[PDB]
Amino acid sequence: RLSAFVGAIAVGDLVKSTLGPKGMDKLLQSASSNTCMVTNDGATILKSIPLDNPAAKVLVNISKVQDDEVGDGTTSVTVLSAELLREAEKLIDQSKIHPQTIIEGYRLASAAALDALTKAAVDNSHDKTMFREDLIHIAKTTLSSKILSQDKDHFAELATNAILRLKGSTNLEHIQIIKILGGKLSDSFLDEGFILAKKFGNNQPKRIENAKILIANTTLDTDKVKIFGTKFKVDSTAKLAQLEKAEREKMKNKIAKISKFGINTFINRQLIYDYPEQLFTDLGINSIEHADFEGVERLALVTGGEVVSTFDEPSKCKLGECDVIEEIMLGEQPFLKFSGCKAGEACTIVLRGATDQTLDEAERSLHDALSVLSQTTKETRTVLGGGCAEMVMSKAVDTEAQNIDGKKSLAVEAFARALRQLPTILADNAGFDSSELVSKLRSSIYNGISTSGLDLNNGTIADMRQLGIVESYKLKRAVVSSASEAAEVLLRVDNIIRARPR
Amino acid sequence: NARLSAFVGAIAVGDLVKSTLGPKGMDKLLQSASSNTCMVTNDGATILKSIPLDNPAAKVLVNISKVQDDEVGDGTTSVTVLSAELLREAEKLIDQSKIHPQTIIEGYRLASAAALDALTKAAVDNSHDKTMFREDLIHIAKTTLSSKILSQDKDHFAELATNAILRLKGSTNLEHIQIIKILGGKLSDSFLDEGFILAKKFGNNQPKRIENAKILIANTTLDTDKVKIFGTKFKVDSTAKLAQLEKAEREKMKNKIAKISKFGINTFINRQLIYDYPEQLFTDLGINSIEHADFEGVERLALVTGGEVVSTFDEPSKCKLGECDVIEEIMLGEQPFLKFSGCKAGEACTIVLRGATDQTLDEAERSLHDALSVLSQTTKETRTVLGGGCAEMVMSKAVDTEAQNIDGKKSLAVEAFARALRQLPTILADNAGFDSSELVSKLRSSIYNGISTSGLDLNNGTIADMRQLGIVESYKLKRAVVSSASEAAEVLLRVDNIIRARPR
Amino acid sequence: KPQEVRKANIIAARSVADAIRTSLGPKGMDKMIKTSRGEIIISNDGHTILKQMAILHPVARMLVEVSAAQDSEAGDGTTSVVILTGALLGAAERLLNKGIHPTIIADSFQSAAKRSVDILLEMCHKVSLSDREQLVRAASTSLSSKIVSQYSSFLAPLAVDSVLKISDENSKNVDLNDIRLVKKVGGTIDDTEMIDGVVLTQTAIKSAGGPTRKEKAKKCNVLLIQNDLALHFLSKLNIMVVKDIEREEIEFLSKGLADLVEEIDSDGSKIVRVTGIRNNNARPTVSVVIRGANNMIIDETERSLHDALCVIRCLVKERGLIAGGGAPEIEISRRLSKEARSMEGVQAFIWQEFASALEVIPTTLAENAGLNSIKVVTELRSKHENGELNDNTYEEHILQPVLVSTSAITLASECVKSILRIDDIAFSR
Amino acid sequence: PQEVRKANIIAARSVADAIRTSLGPKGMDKMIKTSRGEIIISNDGHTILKQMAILHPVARMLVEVSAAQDSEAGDGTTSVVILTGALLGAAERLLNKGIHPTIIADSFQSAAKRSVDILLEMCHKVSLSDREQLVRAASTSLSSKIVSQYSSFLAPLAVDSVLKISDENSKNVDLNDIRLVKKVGGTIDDTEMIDGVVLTQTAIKSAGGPTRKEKAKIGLIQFQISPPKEERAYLLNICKKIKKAKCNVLLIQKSILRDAVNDLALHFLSKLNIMVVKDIEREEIEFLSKGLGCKPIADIELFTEDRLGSADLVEEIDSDGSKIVRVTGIRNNNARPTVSVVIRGANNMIIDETERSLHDALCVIRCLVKERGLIAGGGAPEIEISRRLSKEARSMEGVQAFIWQEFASALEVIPTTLAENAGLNSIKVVTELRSKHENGELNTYEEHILQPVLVSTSAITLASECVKSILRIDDIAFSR
C-alpha cells in the first residue's frame, strides 16, 4: 500500500510544481549529462525517466488516454490523482473503510460536481443570431468530396436543426439513421417520430391513443431454439404435446405481471406465439418486434424508460408513454411515426437514396458533419477559473456529505479536501500564501457570491467576470473523468505484481 | 526538539492514561525496580505522578492536573485526555505553518466561548419543586449560625438569606450582594433591599431625585492638580502666575467635559473631587457628579447595570453604559445614604445589619459569607446535562458555526478545535470495544441540523436516545474540564523552547 | 505497537500454564526447581511451584494471586485453574487477528461464567448438611492420596463433627483459619481429643508453686504473657500463669475466645484444655489436635486433613456435589456449542471458542494418566450423550465438590480479564 | 526543495567568484589543464567556461549566456557572469526570510526593464551620420591589442562597412556575412574592401590556367572533375554542359574523397578561359549562397543559368605569399552588399590576433545600430542605477520593496572588482565615485574610454533571465 500511495506521490511531485504558467520546472539528466533539457511538459518528464516502481506504470497509461481527447490538462490529471492517494493514508489507519465504498463515494461526489459546474458555466454563444447563422456555413464546408455537395442549403439545414433542438447530450446515440432504397436524396426530411423499418401486428389497428411503453427482453415463444440432440420418451404421440401445452399455462404468470401495469404497448426482441398474442388482443396490448440494440436503449431515453429485462417487484418500475402512435406507408414499406412523446428530445434523419453506395457515403459523411457542429457545444464554452470552479465543487460535495451513512462519511469528506488542493498548489507557484487565499475563498462562497475567485496578480479575491479569466468546461470534465477512473483501480490494489519487461 | 518534547513526548505520556478513560477503559501496570512493590489501578492521576518522567515538558502537565484535584477533584483523567487531543490537532497546525502558536491560542478563546453558550441552552437542572429545596435551605442556614452571635434569632436571619439566593437568577458570586453596616442599632431591625446603597451623599444643591440616570466610569482629578510642586524650578515674575498655570492645565479638560454631554448621560462618576467651575457647568448641561465611588463599589455597580469600567476616553460615542430609573437620597442612622433603583435587568440585593459596636459588625459579615457559600454551592451541584456524547457533539457543531465568519489564518485554528472535540467519542468507542469510525460518522450526521436527541449507547453498540435511558452528566464537570484543558494547552504552546531539566 | 506488547505477555503466560499442565493429577510430571539459596524442593502441587518460582514477569504473577485465592476459597484446583486460564489466552490469540477488541472478549467471559454455573447446577445433585453419611465418605476419599490409609477411617468423623457444630444455617463463608491443627511429638493417629472450647500451643509452668489447674477461671485466675519471683507471688493468690505465648497465636486467640481449666497429658504433651466458653459474640472455635511419633507423620497428616476441611467448606457455602475427572466439562461444551446459534454478532463466535477451552482440563487428565489423548476425549462425548453423570467415577468414589468447579471458572474469568486489559507497562518508582 | 537550489547556488557562486578575478586586463588569469595535456592561459570568460567541462547542470547555463553575450553585444562575457553570481549571492538571505522564488524571479525581470530607461535618460544621444564618434569608438577599442599606429587606418574601414549594411530599421545584422580571410604575407597597411565577395583560398597554380577572367558567372557546384570511378571523352561532356550556360567560374567543394580537377580537363578549360577555384570549405558553402544569391548544385542536370551569379572582373592579385582572388560587381539586387575584409601580415601571430581584434571592433559599432548612444565604463553605469533605486525603493510595498534595495547592492560588485584588479582599495575608490556624484554624472571622457550601451543593457537582461531559470528547477533526477 505504501508503493501504491506514497510511491505514487513522488511520481506526482514532478508534475506538481510544474502546473500553471508560473509553475516551476524540472531537470532531466542522463549519464553523459550533455543531452539534458529544461521543460515544463509533464508527459515528457514521466516518459523519459525510467520508473523502477512497478506501481508507477499504471499512471503511464492514464496520461495516454487523456492525451487522446485533448492535449491540454495532462499535468492536472496526475496532480489531482496524487491528492486523492495522499489522503488515502488517513483512510486506512484512523478510518478503516473499505476501498470500494470510498470509490462509490467519489461517484456520488462527481455527480454533484458536474451538475454544480453546469449551472455556473458561461459561454460565448450570446447573441445567437450571429452564432446560429454561422452553423450552417460550417457544415457546407465539410461537404467537399462528399456526394451531399449537390445541394448545400437543404442538406446542411437538416444537420443544423439536428443539434440545437437536442437540448442535451450531443452524442450520436440520440440521432437515428435509417437507410432505405427507391428514392432521391432531395426528398429527405427531419422527423422526430422514431421511424423504423419493421411493422407489428396483423389485424390490429394502426393508430394508438395514450400509449404506455414498457421495455423488456424475454423469449415467450419456443425457447431452446435448437432441438437437435434431444430425446423424447413418451407412451403415445398425444402425450408428447402435453409438455408444450403445459408451457402455455405457465405463460399466464408472465402475462399477469404485464397486465397489472396497465400498458397497451409491449417491446420484444424475439417473436411471440399466437396464444400469448391472442390474449393481448382482449387486453389491447400491441407488441413491437426487431428492436435491435440502439432501438432498445434509444426508446428508453426519449420515453423515459428502463433497459432492465426482469421484474424485481410488481407495480414498481420505470414506465414510458406517448400520446399517439401513427403508422404510415412510404416507398412501398410501412413506417412507424410516433407522436406526443413526453419530454422527448431526439431527432431522426431519414436518408432516402437511389442505391446502396449512396447510403453508406451519406451516413459516414453525416457523422463527420455533425461531429463538427456537436464540437461547438464543448468548445468555446468556459467556466470561471482562478480557484472559483475548484471551490464551487467543494460546496456540492459538502451537500452530499450532510446526509450519508457511516462508511462513506469520511470518504466523501476527504474528496472535498482534494478539490481545494488545486488552488493551493497554484498559489504556491505564484509566490503568495496559499493557506490565506484558499481559506478566505471558502467563507465567501459559502454564503452567496458564487462568482468570486482568486486573483494571482493582486493576491486577493476579485470578481472573475470583471477580470475575464476563464477556463474551458470540457477540460474540467476530462480531468475529473480521468481521475475517477485512475483512482478506481489504484485504491482497489491490495498487492503489486511487477510487469514483465518487453 | 523543543515542541517535539511538548507534543510527541506529551502524547506518549498522554496515551498512557488515554485508554483508561471510562469504566470500560483499559488498565496499566506500574512496575518498580524490585518489581515486588508494584500495583494495578485505574487512576489516571496516580499513573502520571508515580512514573518518573525525565522530560521537562511532561513535568508541567503534572502540576496542571493538581489544580483540578484541589478545586473540584472529579474528572481529573478526562482533563489530561482532552488536553492530549488538543496537542494532536495543534501539532498538525504548526508543522504545516511554522507560525507562533499564540495566534492559534487566540482562536481557542473564541471557540471556547461558543462551546459554553451551546451547553447553557440545552442544560437541565434538578431545581424543580423548589418547595422542597427551600425548606432544606433555611434549615442548613440555621446550622451555620451556631457559635456565632447571629444565633440570637434564627428565623429572621435565615429568611433574609433565603430571599438573597433563589431570587438572584444568575451568578452566585458575592459581588451581587451589598453589605451595609451601621452603628447604634439592633440586629433584629435588619431588612432586605434590592438596591445598590452608598453613603456620603454627593453634592450640596444637587437634587435628591434623578429620573433615567446613566452610569459612566472614569478616573480624573478636576480639583487641586499638581499634588507635589516641591523640587520643580519656578521662574515667575509674579506670584499670581503660579495659579494661572493650574488653570491652563484644567482648561484643556473642557474637551473631555464636552464629551460627557455628547454621551447622552445625565450623571458622571469620579473618584476624586471636582473644582467649582467644572462642577457649575454640570448644572447647565444636566450632569450629576457622584463622589466616593472607591473601587469595589465601582466593579459591583458595572456588573449589575451591565456597564464597563475604564480610566481613559478612547473615542466619543463608543462605550458600554448602564442605567437606573430612580435614585433616591435619604438619611438613616444619622448618616447620609444613597439609593439606586430601576436598573435594567438588575439582579442584586443588599442586607443592612445594625450592630452595637465594631466587633459585632466584622463577625456578622464574615459569618454571612461562609453561610451563603455553602448554600450557593448547591446551585452548581446536582445540576446535570444530557450526556452520552450528545453534549460533546453539540460543542462540535457550535464551533462549526464560528467557522463561517473567520479570518484567513484563524480558520484552521478554530476548525482544528472542533476535531479534538470529536475525539472523545473516538476514544470511548475504542476503549469499549466498538468501531469509532462507524459510530462517530452516524452521530455527527444526525446532530448536524436539528431535532437530535441521539447519543452514544454502549449496551447495544449503536446510536440510541440517551433521554429515554436516563444517561446524564454533571454540568459543573463540563465547564471544569473545558476550562482546565484550555489553560493546559496554553501553557505548552506559549513555551517556544524547553531546556532539558536536570536529571536526578 | 500497543497490542504487540500485550501479545508478548500472553506467550510468556502460556509457557507457564504449559509447565503446570504436566503436573496436573497424582500421575502428573514433577518439576525440579533450584532456589538461589541452594534449597532443592520438588512436588506436584501447583501452589508450591508458583510460590517458589520467583516469577519476574508482571502479568505472569497474576496466576500466583489466583492460586492463593483458589486455596483460600475452594481449597482445591490450584493446578487446574492455571490450565483453564491459559486456555482462554490461547483462544484469544486468533481473536486478535480478526480485529476483535479485548473488551468484548473480557465482557463475554462474564456472561459465559455465569451461564456455566447455572448449567452445572442443573446436573448437580443438591445435598444437605443434615446427612452425616455423605460427609464421612466424602472426606475419606481425599485421604486416599496419602500414606495413611487404614488409620484414616477414624479421621473422617473428626473433621465432619467439627464443621457441623459451627455450620448452623446460611453461614456463607466459613473461615478455616479458626480451625488449628495441633502438631505434637508422641502419641498415635487413633488418639485424638476434640476439645471444642479451644486448644493452645504451649505447655504450663514446670516450676514449683504453679497450680496448673483451676476451676471457674477467666479476679484474674489465668493470665497470658507474650520472673521467678512473680510466680511465687501469684502462687499464694491461686492465680495460674501461662507464659511463652507464641506471637502468631495472639491474633488467633483474640477471635475464638471458662468452666473448668485442667492439664491433661496423654504422653509427654502437658497441654491445657478449656471447655464451655459460652460466649455470645464469640462462636465455638474448635482446634484439632494431631498426635504422632515420627515427624513425617504429623506433617503429611496436616496437609491431608487441611484439604479435607476445604472439601467440606465447599459443601457448606454451596450445596451439591458432582463427579470429578472432567465429566461435567464435556456436557457443558456440548450445550454451549448448540446454544451459540442463539446469539448474534461477534459475541456469538466467542461461545464456540469458550466451549473448546473447557475441554483442556479433561484432556490433560487423560494425557498424564498414560491413556491416549484424543481417543479418551472422543469416548467422553459419546457416553455422556445417553447417560447423565453416570461416567464410572461414582463406583470409584471420586467426588469433586461443585464450588471448586464454580470457583475455577469464576477466578479464571477475572484472571484472563486482568491480563488483556493491560495494553502497556512502564517503569514506575 | 531548498536543499537542491541552495546546493546549485553555492556551486554557481564559486564559479562566478572564480571568473570575477579575471575581470579586466589586469585581472587574475585562470589555468585549465586538459586530460590530454593541453594547458590554455587567457582572461576570456567564454573560453574558460567552455574548456572547464563543468559537471554541474545549472552551472553549464553560463556558457549559453556567455555565447549570447558575445553574439549580441560582443563584450562583457566576464561581467555578465559576475552579475549572475551577484544575484545568486544576495538570494541566499532571501530564502531565509521565507520569500518564494516567484517574487524573486518576477522582480528581476521588472527591474531589468526599468533599468534600461534609466540608462537611456543618462546616455548621450548620438547619430550614425556623424563619423567623428564612429572612428574614435573603434580606434580606442584597439588600444588593448598589439596594433597601435595601424589601428587608426583600420578604423574608417570598419565604419564604412557597417553603415552600408546597417540601413535604419534593419536592427540586428547577421555577422556571418562578414568573413575575415587571413593569409601569410603582405602587411596591415594594404587593405581591400572588395564588397562583392572574398574566398578563403587561392586559384589553380598549374600550367594552362588563365587565373583571370572578365565578365564571368559564379555559382555553387557540388560536382567534381574525376576520371571514371576514353577519359577525355567523359570529361568533354562535363565541360560542354557548362558552356551551354556560359559559366566561366567553377567552385568545387573541398572533399578528401576524390580529387578536384583532372589535369586533362585543364587543357580543355584553357581554350574557353574558364577559371576554376578549388578547396572550398564547407563553412563557405552557406556564405557564398547568401552574398552571391546562388544555390548549391549537386548534379549536372540541376545546373542552370538562372542560378548563376555575375562578376564584372575576376583576377588574381599579385602579392607575396598571398595571391588573393577578388570579385567585384556581383550585380545582385536581392542580395545585400556585405563586406569581406582580407587580413595580411608576415607573421602568423599577426593575422590571428588581428582577426579577433576586428570582431570586437565591429560589434561595438553594431551596438549603435540597434540602440544609439554610449555610456562610459569603469563602474559609471552600475553605480548610476543604484543612485536612482535608493529613493525608488521607498515607494514600493510588500516583499518586492526589499528586493529593490538588494538589487542595487549587487550592482556594486562590478565597480568593486574593477578597483581590486587595479591594485587600488576596493571601498575607498567606490566612495570617491559616489561623493562627486552630487555634481558630476558621467565623469573617463578625457582618457578616451568609451563603451556601448548594448553591453550594459544585455548584461542585465541576460543575467535576469539566467538567475530566473536557476530557481525554477527545484529537483534533479536521472533520466535515460
Resolution value (Å, 1 decimal): 4.4
* Residue C298, CB-side half-sphere exposure with 13 Å CA sphere: 18
Q: What are the grid coordinates assigned to A228, written together?
A: 437437435
Q: Which residues pair with B457 in a beta bridge?
A: B462
Q: Beta strand D30-33 with D249-253: parallel, antiparallel or unpaired? A: unpaired
- And the C-alpha cell for C409? 471458572
Select from D284, D295, D324, D270 the least CA-distant residue to D218. D295
B412 in contact with chain A, both atoms CB, cutoff 8 A: yes
Q: Report residue A394: phi and psi, to 5°.
A: -70, -30
Radius of gyration of chain B (CA): 30
CATH number of the domain that A362 lies in? Answer: 3.30.260.10
Residue B369, CB half-sphere, CA atoms under 13 Å: how many?
11
Size of interface A-D (CB pairs under 8 A): 57
Of the candidates A399, A375, A204, the residue with the CA atom closest to the CA atom of residue A283: A204
Residue D311: CB atoms within 10 Å: 24
Domain co-membership, A418 together with A454: yes
Residues of B in contact with C100 (CB under 8 A): 433
Q: Which residue of A has its CA nearest to B413?
A: A439
Strands (E), B399-445: none
Residue B239 contacts by C-beta under 8 Å, 6 or more apart in sequence?
A: none
Residues C296, D236: Cα–Cα separation, whole Å: 145
- The string of DSSP letters for D400-450 reads HHHHHHHHHHHTTHHHHHHHHHTTS-HHHHHHHHHHGGGT-S---TTTT--
Last residue of a domain, one of A278, A305, A334: A334
Q: Which of A86, A408, A440, A441 to mutate to test the interface with B (most CBs of B within 10 A)?
A: A440
Calpha distance C17→C283 (Å, rounded): 41
The C-alpha of D256 sits at a distance from chain A's nearest C-alpha, in angstroms, of 31
Residue C423: DSSP 8-state? E
**Contact flag A405-B441 (C-beta cutoff 8 Å):** yes
Find residue B353's DSSP bridge partners: B181
Same domain, A109 and A231: no
Q: Residue B225 in contact with residue B249, Cβ under 8 Å?
A: yes
Min CA distance, A460 vs chain B (Å)?
11
Backbone interruptions in chain C following residues (C to N > 2.5 Å): 218, 226, 257, 391
Among D103, D104, D480, pick the best mutation site for testing chain A contact (most A Cβ within 10 A): D480
Do A181 and A207 have their domain in common? no
* Catalytic option among D70, D75, D77, D211: D77
By C-alpha distance, the chain A residue nearest B409 is A436
Q: Is B405's CB within 8 Å of A443's CB?
A: yes
Instruction: Name the one residue in this structure whose C-alpha cell is 478545535.
Output: B417
What is the three-class DSSP state of D131?
A: coil
In which region does residue C283 sit, left (phi positive, over 0), alpha (psi from -120 to 50) or beta (all else)? beta
The widest CA-to-CA distance across chain B, in whole angstroms, is: 97
Assess contact for C332 and C359: CB atoms under 8 A: no
* DSSP output for A115-162: HHHHHT-B-S--SHHHHHHHHHHHHHHTTTTSGGGG-HHHHHHHHHHH
Are A220 and A318 members of one domain? Answer: yes
Q: Is A274 a catalytic residue?
A: no
Q: Which amino acid is at D187?
A: T
How far, in Å, are B122, D24, D126, D348 from residue D441 at the CA level? 80, 23, 18, 45
Name the DSSP letter for residue C280: S
Among residues A151, A360, A368, A405, which one is catalytic?
A368
The nearest alpha carbon in chain B to A442 belongs to: B404
Same domain membership, residue A11 and residue A111: yes
What is the 8-class DSSP label of residue A370?
A: H
The C-alpha angle C407, C412, C417, rounded to 5 degrees, equals 135
Name the method of structure determination: cryo-EM
Per DSSP bridges, beta strands D218-221 and D249-253 are parallel
Per-state percent for chain B, helix, strand, coil, to nearest 5: 50, 15, 35
Report the sign of the C-alpha dihedral through residues C406, C407, C408, C413, in that order.
positive
**C-alpha to C-alpha distances, B246 to B241, D83, D275, nearest whole angstrom:** 9, 67, 119
Distance CA D84, CA D468 (A): 10
Sign of CA dihedral A19, A20, A22, A27: positive
How many whole angstroms separate alpha carbon D192 and alpha carbon A123? Answer: 69
CB B372 within 8 A of CB B81: no
Q: From B302, B304, B309, select the one nearest B345 (Cα to Cα).
A: B304
Query: Residues 6 or more apart from D229 whose CB is under 8 A from it?
Result: D258
**What's the number of domains chain B is made of?**
3
Residues 6+ apart with CB under 8 A from B395: B115, B118, B119, B421, B482
CB B353 within 8 A of CB B153: no
- Interface present between D and C (3 or more CB pairs within 8 Å): no
Residue of A nearest to B462 (CA): A406
| CATH number of the domain that residue B121 is part of | 1.10.560.10
Residue type, A441: L
**Alpha-carbon separation of residue A132 from A128, A136, A373, D330 (angstroms):** 5, 8, 11, 61
CA A464/CA B201 separation, integer angstroms: 68
Three-class SS state of B402: helix
CATH fold group of domain D196-336: GroEL (3.50.7)
User: How is residue B274 written as a grid cell?
Assistant: 471636582
Q: Tell whether the torsion through CA atoms of A232, A236, A238 and A239 is positive or negative.
A: negative
Q: List Cβ neighbours of D307 (8 Å cut-off, separation of 6 or more).
A: D219, D294, D295, D297
Residue B213 DSSP SS3: strand
Rounded CA gap, C358 and C328, in Å?
A: 10
Nearest to B24 by CA among B434, B447, B498: B434
Q: How far is it, in rounded angstroms, from Cα A389 to Cα A469?
A: 12
Same-domain pairing of B68 and B146: no
Residue pair B401/B494 in contact (Cβ under 8 Å)? The answer is: no
Question: Three-state SS for C185?
Answer: strand
End-to-end CA, chain A: 26
Instruction: State which H helix or E strand residue B465 sits in.
Output: strand B462-465
Same domain, yes or no, for B195 and B343? yes
Residues in Cβ contact with B229 at an 8 Å cutoff, skipping those fewer than 6 apart: none
Closest CA to C406 of C73, C135, C142: C73
Cell of C372: 491416549
Tell me if B408 and A435 make a contact (CB, 8 A cut-off).
yes
Domain check: are A139 and A118 in the same one? no
| Closest C-alpha among D453, D424, D347 to residue D117 | D453
Neighbours of B91 (CB within 10 A): 18
What does DSSP say about strands D325-328 and D197-198: parallel, antiparallel, or unpaired?
antiparallel
> Which residue reads 461477534 in cell numbers?
C346
D1-126+373-480: CATH topology is: GROEL; domain 1 (1.10.560)
Give bridge partners of residue B214 from the DSSP assignment. B323
> Which residue in B125, B189, B370, B496 is the catalytic one?
B370
User: Rounded to whole angstroms, what are the CA distances from C240 to A474, C223, D273?
Assistant: 116, 7, 171
Domain, as residue range, for A244 = 201-334
Q: Where are the alpha helices (DSSP H) in D187-262?
A: 231-244
- Chain A residues close to D477, C-beta within 8 Å: 14, 26-29, 49
To 5 degrees, how large is the angle CA D192–CA D198–CA D200? 115
Q: What is the DSSP string of A255-314?
A: HHHHHTTT-SEEE-SS---HHHHHHHHHHT-EEE----SHHHHHHHHHHT-----S-SST
CA of D470 to nearest chain A CA: how many angstroms apart? 9
β-pairing, A347-352 vs A175-180, is: parallel
Q: List all chains that touch chain C, counting a touch as 3 or more CB pairs closer than 8 Å.
A: B
End-to-end, the C-alpha distance of chain B in Å comes to: 21
* Catalytic residue status for A74: yes
Q: What is the DSSP letter of B500?
A: P
B441 near A CB under 8 A: yes
H-only helix segments in B125-200:
130-144, 154-163
Indicate if A368 belongs to the active site: yes
If one counts every other C-beta atom within 10 angstroms of the C-beta of residue A193, the result is 19
- Per-residue cell: A375: 464540437
Q: Where do the H-state alpha helices sit in A204-241?
A: 237-240
Report the alpha-carbon angle C55-C60-C65, nearest 5: 90
Q: Residue type for C247, please?
A: R
> Do B425 and B456 touch, CB atoms closer than 8 A?
yes
Distance of CA D433 to the CA centre of its chain: 32
* Cβ–Cβ < 8 Å for D376, D450: yes
- What residues does C125 pair with on adjacent strands? C321
Q: Which residues are CB-contacts of C336 (< 8 A; sequence separation ≥ 6)?
A: C112, C115, C116, C119, C351, C354, C355
The alpha carbon of residue C211 and the mean position of all alpha carbons in its chain are separated, in whole angstroms, by 42
C-alpha–C-alpha distance, residues D140 and D131, integer Å: 14
Quote the CATH superfamily of domain C1-127+320-429: GroEL-like equatorial domain (1.10.560.10)
The Cβ of residue D160 has, within 10 Å, a number of other Cβ atoms equal to: 13
Query: What contacts B408, CB < 8 A, 6 or more positions away?
Result: A435, A436, A437, A439, A440
Q: Given CB atoms, is A402 within the 8 Å cutoff of chain B? A: yes
| Residue ranges per structural domain of chain D | 1-126+373-480, 127-195+337-372, 196-336
Laid out side by side, the sheet with A347-352 consists of A175-180, A347-352, A190-191
Considering A326, A344, A379, which residue would you say is the last residue of a domain? A379
Check if C51 contacts B (Cβ < 8 Å): no
How far lies B112's CA from each of B64, B83, B421, in Å?
19, 14, 11
Residue A119 sits in the same domain as residue A66: yes
Contact B16, C413 (CB under 8 A): no
Q: Is B437 within 8 Å of A96 when comparing Cβ atoms? A: yes
Residues A397 and A493 in one domain: yes
